[PDB]
Amino acid sequence: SRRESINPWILTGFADAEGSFGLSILNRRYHTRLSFAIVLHNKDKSILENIQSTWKVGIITNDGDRYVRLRVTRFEDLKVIIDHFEKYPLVTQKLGDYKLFKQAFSVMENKEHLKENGIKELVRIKAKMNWGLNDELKKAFPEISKERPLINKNIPNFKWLAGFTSGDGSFFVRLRKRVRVQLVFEISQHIRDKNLMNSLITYLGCGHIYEGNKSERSWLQFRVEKFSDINDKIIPVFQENTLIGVKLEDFEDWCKVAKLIEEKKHLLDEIKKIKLNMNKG
DNA sequence: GGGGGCATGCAGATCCCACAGGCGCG
DNA sequence: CCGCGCCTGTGGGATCTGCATGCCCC
Ligand SMILES: [Ca+2]
Ligand SMILES: [Ca+2]
Ligand SMILES: [Ca+2]
Ligand SMILES: [Ca+2]
To answer: Fewer CB atoms inside 10 Å of the end CB: C or N, chain A?
Structure first.
């Protein structure tokens, strides 16, 4: 059960990709709940165990027949999470949800949430957090601003990038029809972090940003399709900065196809065998 | 007696992932 | 011609996010 721990910057990078900070204010006088959660497919339960071993907090639960959840609600345990992200701060817009989550923690640590003044402040905090206030709290506390300080941060290091890639990244092989094999690396992200995704082009020395129609599409792609860039830049980066989860296994199969491509790929039966065991198994 | 915290289960919403096709260029 | 890589496009599920209840304890 007790599995390996992970580098704390890799964990923050995975949290930037897959984490969620929650502030629930329900009328059971109001009940206050703070939470951190990650939901993944069972294939990546090892990641949740890795985080649980590194933080030494959190409950791992099956969220159905297909999914697994790591959830932290115990108040003292949320202090462990604050201390981690204070030393290893998030990079995406989720940092703002973390900061509001931390602000809510100080209201509750000072027991102010038991009185009416604390609830009003917690409602103001929740308004700027994630998807904002629900209809009931919008009516019961109409005083309601969703605006919050802007975030525009740079990639802190490659260890963060490995955890981020383990979450939102993708390694795959294309078989285009004469059949040619092409390696592709892609990270997708909501356009709310376009600057950070643009940051990747010079940070990795390769790649392009693709957006489609910016007026009707809320997410973009950072992609590297040039084999020399995959072979000389992306592979050495993630070989030195270990990925986690099945993304690591997909990367290792990905690199097997890369060695074949640098050795005159065209023969192809072994590449098709590796591809069958990638994002299908 | 019960307020408040914790665990728990489930549902809503969407941002991802893992791709494919057309075609200009060296 | 051939192999490549820019560029455009996306289904649908793995995510992110949120709601509700029960039971314990000081
Ligand atoms: Ca993400
Ligand atoms: Ca993310
Ligand atoms: Ca993921
Ligand atoms: Ca993700």
So the answer is: N
